[PDB]
Structures are given as C-alpha cells and as structure tokens.
C-alpha cells in the first residue's frame, strides 16, 4: 500500500487495501555489494549469532513462599543484534510493480 | 598475546564455551540436590 | 537442541551412510558398496574397504 490510488482501470497487478483505499505494492529487487557492511556482535564470540535459552519445568524446586500453586513453566530466548554500514554507495534497489 | 600459536583461543572463545555448556549441567544438578 | 560451540570447525553435523551391495558395471555382478552423504551432497563413493 505504498503506492498510487488503483482504480477499475488496473491491467493486473497487485495491490492492497489501506484504510477504504486501493493502493499498489512496491518490490524491492535488490543488490548487496562487497564490504559494504559488518554486523555488530555482541559476544556472538565467532560467526553465528548467540542466543540464551532457559526452561524452567514445573515442580517444587520453584514451590516460594507466596504461592506454592502455579506449576506454570516457561521458556525465553534473547539475543543482541545491530548493523554498521561502512560504504552505503554499494548497495541498490530497483522499485517496481509486480504482476497478479 | 600469551603465546606463539597462529590463532589462539582468547578468553572470550572460553567464556562463550562454559555460557553455551552451562544450561546443561544446570538442569542436571537439580537430580543430584 | 540449543547447544552449539564457538569454533566452525569443531561444530557437530548429523551424516548418512550407506552398506550395500550395487551392480557396478552393469553386466548383474553385485559388489559390496559404500555411500557417504550429508544434507544433500555426496561426498563419499567407494568399494567396501574391510577385508
């Protein structure tokens, strides 16, 4: 829906709906070039990014003293993520419309 | 640069190794208790 | 699940392999065969090599 109004008149391309409106779609047809970017990592300590995952199951060994109830386990994931772009003159992008 | 070697671990590498270990032995000492 | 190590290199990957026995030349002799293979690349093809 970044595009301009599509009317009946449209010969077959996709569009969307934004807010009663009829609106064109935008592709990004895209070129990455040679070290034009590093990722910043943050004890990521190699090439892949590093998670953290924990568990917690149900059982006593989270029985408190406010509630002894509530077996209700969990599990959470986190990371740290962030981009440098060096030299932005190496990267393009062609914009068009895509067909039905 | 302790040493000689070409590549050398770095205390991070290490650090990274015992965090990625961890979880394990964690959820195993609970048996033990 | 979760656990992988620092170093590429000592990173841990799961393989197949196959024993069996293959017509080779294609004249109805089997011989004894093994086949190495991971993900979807070959990268192993040789005769049995145990005596």
């Given at each position: 829906?970044?595009?301009?109004?599509?009317?009946?008149?449209?010969?077959?391309?996709?569009?969307?709906?934004?807010?009663?409106?009829?609106?064109?779609?935008?592709?990004?047809?895209?070129?990455?070039?040679?070290?034009?970017?590093?990722?910043?990592?943050?004890?990521?300590?190699?090439?892949?990014?590093?998670?953290?995952?924990?568990?917690?199951?149900?059982?006593?060994?989270?029985?408190?003293?406010?509630?002894?109830?509530?077996?209700?386990?969990?599990?959470?994931?986190?990371?740290?993520?962030?981009?440098?772009?060096?030299?932005?003159?190496?990267?393009?992008?062609?914009?068009?419309?895509?067909?039905? | 640069?302790?040493?000689?070697?070409?590549?050398?671990?770095?205390?991070?590498?290490?650090?990274?190794?015992?965090?990625?270990?961890?979880?394990?032995?964690?959820?195993?000492?609970?048996?033990?208790? | 699940?979760?656990?992988?190590?620092?170093?590429?290199?000592?990173?841990?990957?799961?393989?197949?392999?196959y024993?069996?026995?293959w017509?080779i030349?294609?004249?109805?002799?089997?011989?004894?065969i093994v086949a190495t293979w991971?993900?979807?690349?070959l990268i192993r093809l040789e005769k049995?090599?145990?005596?």
């Amino acid at each position: 829906g970044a595009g301009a109004q599509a009317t009946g008149a449209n010969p077959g391309y996709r569009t969307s709906m934004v807010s009663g409106q009829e609106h064109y779609d935008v592709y990004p047809m895209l070129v990455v070039g040679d070290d034009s970017f590093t990722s910043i990592g943050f004890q990521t300590d190699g090439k892949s990014l590093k998670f953290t995952v924990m568990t917690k199951m149900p059982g006593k060994e989270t029985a408190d003293r406010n509630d002894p109830y509530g077996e209700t386990g969990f599990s959470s994931i986190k990371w740290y993520y962030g981009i440098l772009v060096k030299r932005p003159e190496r990267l393009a992008l062609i914009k068009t419309v895509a067909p039905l | 640069k302790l040493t000689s070697w070409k590549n050398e671990l770095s205390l991070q590498a290490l650090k990274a190794d015992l965090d990625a270990a961890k979880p394990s032995h964690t959820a195993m000492m609970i048996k033990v208790k | 699940q979760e656990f992988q190590i620092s170093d590429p290199m000592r990173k841990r990957v799961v393989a197949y392999e196959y024993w069996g026995f293959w017509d080779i030349e294609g004249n109805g002799v089997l011989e004894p065969i093994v086949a190495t293979w991971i993900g979807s690349t070959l990268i192993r093809l040789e005769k049995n090599p145990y005596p």
